[PDB]
Design a protein around this ligand. Structure first.
Ligand SMILES: Nc1ccc2c(CNC(=O)[C@H](Cc3ccccc3)NC(=O)c3ccc4[nH]c(=O)cc(O)c4c3)cccc2n1
Length: 238
């Protein structure tokens, strides 16, 4: 996160850090608890990942320093990537992780509500992007979970800023015209969380952008409301 500040412990209890153990253990991506056995994240996080056996999901983490060999984690039983996904910049950048065991909810770890199709008209003015990513395009993973308040922009405005791309209605953008605050490398897969009427909703999934926090280059997020039917379909038992 560029231009952000340290989070308070427990203030983003749906935020997880997804690790890979290969070749040695490191943070791979953010993600969001959306159900007792389900993390919502970005499809691009699994580039080159051949098996869910190398993944570990840590919840209730503020500092990466909390994670040691003796720290408990959730195994991943299944990675579910949208079947239309090709790459982050052309959309469908959404994935579900089915955990091997269930999360026991507490104030350190609990789910975020998915948006309602009826909330498509709501004007959110209290949106935050969070993660352990770079503070600048050339940087490194941060110890403490960072947060930044960023305004949503219209898809028409976002499209003007990305003329070589197609910004679809299945994407949503956020950023300041002057730049300065944004997601960056290592933040992808995490939430864009918007508070409205005292309730948090998972509005976006951190997906891509041109550089980090640049002037007139909004962050691009997966527009989660467009995938509520997909999420229901994929999280249904078989
Ligand atoms: N406004 C935005 C939003 C997202 C942006 C992204 C997202 N990509 C990303 O966040 C990419 C995604 C990725 C995942 C797996 C394989 C390849 C790429 N992630 C990373 O580049 C990434 C992830 C985990 C890491 N852990 C480490 O220990 C050290 C790293 O250097 C490291 C880098 C990148 C650049 C600008 C952005 N601007």
């Amino acid at each position: 996160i560029v231009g952000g500040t340290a989070s308070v412990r427990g203030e983003w209890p749906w935020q997880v850090t997804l690790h890979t153990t290969s070749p040695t253990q490191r943070h791979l991506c953010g993600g969001s608890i959306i159900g007792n056995q389900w993390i919502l994240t970005a499809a691009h996080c699994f580039y080159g990942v051949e098996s869910p056996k190398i993944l570990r999901v840590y919840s209730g983490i503020l500092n990466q320093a909390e994670i040691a060999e003796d720290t408990s984690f959730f195994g991943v039983q299944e990675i579910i990537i949208h079947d239309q996904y090709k790459m982050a910049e052309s959309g469908y950048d959404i994935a579900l992780l089915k955990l091997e065991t269930t999360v026991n909810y507490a104030d350190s770890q609990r789910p975020i509500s998915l948006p309602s199709k009826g909330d498509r008209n709501v004007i959110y003015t209290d949106c935050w992007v969070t993660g352990w990513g770079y503070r600048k395009l050339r940087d490194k993973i941060q110890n403490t979970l960072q947060k930044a308040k960023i305004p949503l922009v219209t898809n028409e405005e976002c499209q003007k800023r990305y003329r070589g791309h197609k910004i679809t209605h299945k994407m949503i953008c956020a950023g300041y015209r002057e730049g300065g605050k944004d997601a960056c490398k290592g933040d992808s897969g995490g939430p864009l969380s918007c508070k409205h009427n005292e309730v948090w909703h998972l509005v976006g999934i951190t997906s891509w952008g041109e550089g980090c926090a640049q002037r007139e280059r909004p962050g691009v997020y997966t527009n989660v409301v467009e995938y509520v039917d997909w999420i229901l379909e994929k999280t249904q038992a078989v």
